[PDB]
Design an enzyme around this catalytic site. Structure first.
Site, PDB file in Angstrom:
ATOM      1  N   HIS A  39       0.717  -1.175  -0.117  1.00 14.55           N
ATOM      2  CA  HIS A  39      -0.213  -0.034   0.020  1.00 14.55           C
ATOM      3  C   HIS A  39       0.713   1.427   0.062  1.00 14.55           C
ATOM      4  O   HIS A  39       1.896   1.453   0.447  1.00 14.55           O
ATOM      5  CB  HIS A  39      -0.716  -0.100   1.297  1.00 14.55           C
ATOM      6  N   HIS A  82      -3.630   4.179   5.431  1.00 14.86           N
ATOM      7  CA  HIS A  82      -3.659   4.134   3.896  1.00 14.86           C
ATOM      8  C   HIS A  82      -4.032   5.377   3.550  1.00 14.86           C
ATOM      9  O   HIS A  82      -4.629   6.295   4.002  1.00 14.86           O
ATOM     10  CB  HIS A  82      -4.750   3.212   3.268  1.00 14.86           C
ATOM     11  N   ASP A 141      -4.507   2.002  -2.166  1.00 15.75           N
ATOM     12  CA  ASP A 141      -4.721   0.186  -2.185  1.00 15.75           C
ATOM     13  C   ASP A 141      -4.248  -0.456  -3.359  1.00 15.75           C
ATOM     14  O   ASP A 141      -4.919  -0.639  -4.518  1.00 15.75           O
ATOM     15  CB  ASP A 141      -6.349  -0.065  -2.107  1.00 15.75           C
ATOM     16  N   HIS A 179       3.826  -5.463   3.677  1.00 15.62           N
ATOM     17  CA  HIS A 179       3.175  -6.120   5.052  1.00 15.62           C
ATOM     18  C   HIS A 179       3.524  -7.477   5.342  1.00 15.62           C
ATOM     19  O   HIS A 179       3.942  -8.278   4.276  1.00 15.62           O
ATOM     20  CB  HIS A 179       1.788  -5.830   5.206  1.00 15.62           C
TER      21      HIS A 179
HETATM   22 CU   LIG Z   1      -0.152  -0.838   4.090  1.00 13.90          CU
HETATM   23 ZN   LIG Z   2      -6.614   0.635   2.074  1.00 14.53          ZN
END
Ligand SMILES: [Cu+2]
Ligand SMILES: [Zn+2]
Ligand SMILES: CN1CCCN(c2nc(C(F)(F)F)nc3ccccc23)CC1
Ligand SMILES: CN1CCCN(c2nc(C(F)(F)F)nc3ccccc23)CC1
Ligand SMILES: [Cu+2]
Ligand SMILES: [Zn+2]
Lengths: 153, 153
Positions: A46, A63, A83, A120
């Site tokens: 992200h 985000h 995203d 992540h």
């Molecule tokens: Cu992230």
């Molecule tokens: Zn998001």
């Protein structure tokens, strides 16, 4: 043509380089590169709001979501600008990144330059996880590596 | 108000955190923070053109110079946009940074977000030195630490 770049680093084994190219200001952004040190499987990927690494990747905030939408995947209408889904690593511990996106930009109100790219611990469920957390972070876990997105030559 | 931030890292450790704040887009930028691990004396302090640290601080390129001017000090009319002078370190190896500048900006075509802040080995001569190089780099030497300038909360 405009270009951007990000060096991903963290506290453990994960490191990468990600390039961005946008041929026209209203056109899609091509995103490509490699990340090493990743466990096998999916890892959420992200753009986070702040290009702040003062205390590590946690300083980058939520985000990037200029339009106040819920979390989703890149092919959803209902998504944060930030995203970008998941990158997938093999047993070799490498994720090859190859993404085209029409929602991020390298100029205007959706501009991602100066913000933070994060990879992540776990998979992003793309907002399809059926819990409240799915609609905010996609349940992708801790931040393994990150960098600030900068203007490239 | 716009805010930005930069984490400086390099071998030493030469390490610092530098904050930026601009109350209004037609206004000056306040720049403050701390850098540790520096030798006593002056160290050149510049915004460089690219936010690219792919191969270290050398990837950032030349001083940010959108107006095609020659190198100078911060108080000179004839300067690069990226010309922020020197930070001074004492015997305790710390430079306290406290700068107000009317030429850098956090928006517009003098925007420094997404570019690289660099602290140098030696003094910047502020373009008043003997030579060809004074008008280009200020003779400030190698790049001790750098980081990409990012949007802050
Ligand atoms: Cu992230
Ligand atoms: Zn998001
Ligand atoms: C500067 N270019 C022209 C754009 C095409 N590029 C790429 N784009 C894409 C993309 F983003 F999917 F279109 N993926 C790549 C994967 C590996 C190597 C290069 C890739 C990068 C090479
Ligand atoms: C709450 N604020 C408003 C932003 C301006 N700040 C500062 N500005 C400046 C400046 F940039 F010179 F004006 N210098 C500082 C030196 C030490 C500590 C803080 C400094 C930080 C204090
Ligand atoms: Cu410099
Ligand atoms: Zn200069």
């Amino acid at each position: 043509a405009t270009k951007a770049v990000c060096v991903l680093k963290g506290d453990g084994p994960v490191q990468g380089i990600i390039n961005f190219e946008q041929k026209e200001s209203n056109g899609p952004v091509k995103v490509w590169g490699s990340i090493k040190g990743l466990t096998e499987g999916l890892h959420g990927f992200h753009v986070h709001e702040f290009g702040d690494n003062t205390a590590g990747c946690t300083s980058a905030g939520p985000h990037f979501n200029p339009l106040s939408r819920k979390h989703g995947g890149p092919k959803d209408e209902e998504r944060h600008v930030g995203d970008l889904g998941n990158v997938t690593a093999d047993k070799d511990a490498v994720a090859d990144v190859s993404i085209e996106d029409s929602v991020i930009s390298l100029s205007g109100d959706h501009c991602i330059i100066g913000r933070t790219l994060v990879v992540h611990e776990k998979a992003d469920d793309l907002g399809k996880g059926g819990n409240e957390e799915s609609t905010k972070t996609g349940n992708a876990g801790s931040r393994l590596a990150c960098g600030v997105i900068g203007i490239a030559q």
